Amino acid sequence: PQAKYRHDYRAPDYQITDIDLTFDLDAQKTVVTAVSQAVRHGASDAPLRLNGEDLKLVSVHINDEPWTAWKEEEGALVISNLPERFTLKIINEISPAANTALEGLYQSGDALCTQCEAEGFRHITYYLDRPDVLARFTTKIIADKIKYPFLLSNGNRVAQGELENGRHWVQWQDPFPKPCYLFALVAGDFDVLRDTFTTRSGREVALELYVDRGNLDRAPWAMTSLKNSMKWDEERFGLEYDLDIYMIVAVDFFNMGAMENKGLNIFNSKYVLARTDTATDKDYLDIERVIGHEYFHNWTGNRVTCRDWFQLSLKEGLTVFRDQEFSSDLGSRAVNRINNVRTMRGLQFAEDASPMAHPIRPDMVIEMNNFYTLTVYEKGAEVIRMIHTLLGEENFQKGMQLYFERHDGSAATCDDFVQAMEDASNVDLSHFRRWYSQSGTPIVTVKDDYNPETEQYTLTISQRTPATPDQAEKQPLHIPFAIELYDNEGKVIPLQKGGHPVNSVLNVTQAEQTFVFDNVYFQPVPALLCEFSAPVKLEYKWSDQQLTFLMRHARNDFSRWDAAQSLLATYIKLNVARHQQGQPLSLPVHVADAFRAVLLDEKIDPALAAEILTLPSVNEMAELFDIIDPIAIAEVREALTRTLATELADELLAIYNANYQSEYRVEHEDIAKRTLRNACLRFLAFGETHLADVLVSKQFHEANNMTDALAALSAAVAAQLPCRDALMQEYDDKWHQNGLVMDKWFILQATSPAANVLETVRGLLQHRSFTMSNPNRIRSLIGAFAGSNPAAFHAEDGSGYLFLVEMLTDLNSRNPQVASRLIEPLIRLKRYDAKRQEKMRAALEQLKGLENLSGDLYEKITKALA
Numbered sequence: 001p002q003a004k005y006r007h008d009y010r011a012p013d014y015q016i017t018d019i020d021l022t023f024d025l026d027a028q029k030t031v032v033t034a035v036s037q038a039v040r041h042g043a044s045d046a047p048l049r050l051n052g053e054d055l056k057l058v059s060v061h062i063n064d065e066p067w068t069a070w071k072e073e074e075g076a077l078v079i080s081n082l083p084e085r086f087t088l089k090i091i092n093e094i095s096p097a098a099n100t101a102l103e104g105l106y107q108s109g110d111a112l113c114t115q116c117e118a119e120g121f122r123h124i125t126y127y128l129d130r131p132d133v134l135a136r137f138t139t140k141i142i143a144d145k146i147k148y149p150f151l152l153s154n155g156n157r158v159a160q161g162e163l164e165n166g167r168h169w170v171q172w173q174d175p176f177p178k179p180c181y182l183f184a185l186v187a188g189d190f191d192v193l194r195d196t197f198t199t200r201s202g203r204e205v206a207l208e209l210y211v212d213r214g215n216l217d218r219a220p221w222a223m224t225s226l227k228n229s230m231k232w233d234e235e236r237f238g239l240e241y242d243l244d245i246y247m248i249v250a251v252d253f254f255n256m257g258a259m260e261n262k263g264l265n266i267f268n269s270k271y272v273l274a275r276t277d278t279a280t281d282k283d284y285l286d287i288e289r290v291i292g293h294e295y296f297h298n299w300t301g302n303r304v305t306c307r308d309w310f311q312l313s314l315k316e317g318l319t320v321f322r323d324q325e326f327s328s329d330l331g332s333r334a335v336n337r338i339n340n341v342r343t344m345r346g347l348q349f350a351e352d353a354s355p356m357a358h359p360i361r362p363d364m365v366i367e368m369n370n371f372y373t374l375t376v377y378e379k380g381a382e383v384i385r386m387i388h389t390l391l392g393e394e395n396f397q398k399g400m401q402l403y404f405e406r407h408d409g410s411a412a413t414c415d416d417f418v419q420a421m422e423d424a425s426n427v428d429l430s431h432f433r434r435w436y437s438q439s440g441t442p443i444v445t446v447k448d449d450y451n452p453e454t455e456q457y458t459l460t461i462s463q464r465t466p467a468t469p470d471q472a473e474k475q476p477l478h479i480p481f482a483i484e485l486y487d488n489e490g491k492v493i494p495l496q497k498g499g500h501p502v503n504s505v506l507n508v509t510q511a512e513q514t515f516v517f518d519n520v521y522f523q524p525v526p527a528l529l530c531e532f533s534a535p536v537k538l539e540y541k542w543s544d545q546q547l548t549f550l551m552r553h554a555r556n557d558f559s560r561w562d563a564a565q566s567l568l569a570t571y572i573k574l575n576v577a578r579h580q581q582g583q584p585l586s587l588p589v590h591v592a593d594a595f596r597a598v599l600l601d602e603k604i605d606p607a608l609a610a611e612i613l614t615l616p617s618v619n620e621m622a623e624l625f626d627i628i629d630p631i632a633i634a635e636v637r638e639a640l641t642r643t644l645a646t647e648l649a650d651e652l653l654a655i656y657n658a659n660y661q662s663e664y665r666v667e668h669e670d671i672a673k674r675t676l677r678n679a680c681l682r683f684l685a686f687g688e689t690h691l692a693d694v695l696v697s698k699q700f701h702e703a704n705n706m707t708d709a710l711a712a713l714s715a716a717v718a719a720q721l722p723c724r725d726a727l728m729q730e731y732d733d734k735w736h737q738n739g740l741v742m743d744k745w746f747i748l749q750a751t752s753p754a755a756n757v758l759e760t761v762r763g764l765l766q767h768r769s770f771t772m773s774n775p776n777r778i779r780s781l782i783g784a785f786a787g788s789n790p791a792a793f794h795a796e797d798g799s800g801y802l803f804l805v806e807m808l809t810d811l812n813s814r815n816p817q818v819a820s821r822l823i824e825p826l827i828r829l830k831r832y833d834a835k836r837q838e839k840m841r842a843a844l845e846q847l848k849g850l851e852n853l854s855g856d857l858y859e860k861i862t863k864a865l866a
């Protein structure tokens, strides 16, 4: 497999302006007729090179003349000797039922559906499968009326007909030119939830949510979230929907989360279906996030698209930013920020320290499906957020406005977007652009001094990004570094110098620089990198008392949680070292006291309390260490939980009871109280065994919603309580017919601390609710084991690696995209001890030797073994 490079981008030799597609649909053999109007822009002797994969070519015509001047090559149809303007007609066959990779046209249960991003359209017909080729689509679909009574594509229905032999047809037209990755087709039988949204300016939009027969009871929340997204984009960004119909189709078989195809989004059912007995608070908020996300792409991705796939973050960073802003505006901003920062520090930093490290705008890609990453998405969003921090909301919105004014109806670049922001705001972003080109996590080191003679506070701030596998050269970045200074009363000290106020967002642009502040009337306690103002690791020599002071006094709830994290980091590191020496947990009394104070604080937002009382995950803990000891981390997390459970037992039970709610509401105040109650339950489960077992069993049985039931079940598994096996069996017996609900149970099985967890996981490959044919099931059992049970995955006998090799040997052939998702824990080998590295290396070497190794896995394996 050959790498492609960003610097090799060149405008296409040919454009296509219009394409008329006909599908004669059948699961075994679908016939595609594609009539394209093409224009040559390149040299008169340049051939037209069409991408195509796994197509059976039937005929090629140019202006209705059977064409003799063509050849098929690997992945392509090369057509020579063309006029400047012409009509290309391709007829070819494909086989949806054979498509186990779920890219192009495939089968999802009884439905046929498409996934074209990034390069799936070339699995449907021979085309210019590149996002800088925008064309106006019409789509005619012909199918069996009984099997496929709904035939959907992008845009509006313009024609329909009936045929003999029980077939019918519908034709769709989408007026907006689009790259082919935004093409969608769906055929099947569905229940349909229909509603309406009227835009600010009065455009009535028909909303249609297509779900499998019998699932209408699970559709209203997704519909509500769609309307909420539409309203918010109007209010916040001044953007209205631009078509007459908005369709969403929920499908069970889908490699990612959801897809923004123009006017016809296709969603993994996990991000659509919810009822209070099947879905948790987290599920509701994720449906809200993902519905919003795909909707927000209508402008940031569709109306302005990507010139090439190296510009993926142009749409993903910005749309992730938009979905975060949506969730934050509607819900708790602090909880959203906290959770997004957990993801950055615990998962994205890991990627940036791995063989797969890349800038948010990659320079080199072998398989583009490998670059739908934490970096491109979540770090991409942090980069957009830094622009927002530097510009402020008003200037940022001016930049958005200029971006659309310049680029609406075209494919643009990351650089185009930065230039629009810079031009609209008059803020210089020339240095800032380096965030697009440089991979790895910067480390920002802060030293301070207080001078009582002059009442000056001095911050000496340095930065460096360590070399990464992809880049030997690193340079200083433009780091927006937000600070606050607190006096002894917990009041904010005004930032000033030489009689003039100083902006609290410091521009850290050099390898080292000093900032001096005047009229600092008391030695300050600083809050540093406020609201995680740049995606960096902070090195500052905090005292415990500075941190507990911030937990008490910091103005922003994020800073209070972040202070608690810094406090915990010290003792997590202490206790991992102790575990390695065979010693039990040690924790100063004043540390437990800080968490007691959070429990008993009557003024603190329960949403914030809940997050402070949620310990960093084993993944967040891992990124505190150069060399990861996953067993020590797991056992320290448990020991810390047990210690706090014992020290805080009375307080935990009081707060658990105080936050009882008889009514279940998907409302932010209620969610906050419930998150706090369940955080308390988690500790209580690790307290005295009998009380724990009673409390957990009672909550599981008395729960009137899945949030509370799952919290209890999860605690029973985590703490290995007597009731565990009974509760797990009850859940299976009740829910086995419901895959999405069973995913939660497979996750609990996979992440179990039980000694026999791998045995159980292997056995579950035969479970009635499991199938290797379904990405969600695969991710919930196998993925959760490898990625979310590192203690078991990294068992010293190497059994975890061997299991993953076995699974990837199947998935490499079946569904390379899912295989590539699942190989990730194995490519982190350099973070582990020598003995583990050698076993993981052996595992990777076995995979490298697979017959018919997918490009997806090849790219990751070669980087890992380098």
Ligand SMILES: N[C@@H](Cc1ccc(O)cc1)C(=O)O
Binding pocket: 115, 116, 117, 118, 255, 256, 257, 258, 259, 260, 293, 294, 297, 316, 372
């Ligand atoms: N474009 C989708 C993501 C996606 C990408 C590729 C896929 O195959 C599926 C989904 C989004 O981020 O909104």
Ligand code: NA
Binding pocket: 351, 352, 353, 356, 357, 358, 359, 375, 439, 440
């Ligand atoms: Na990276």
Ligand code: NA
Binding pocket: 447, 448, 449, 450
């Ligand atoms: Na100091």
Ligand SMILES: [Zn+2]
Binding pocket: 293, 297, 315, 316, 319, 320
């Ligand atoms: Zn997206």
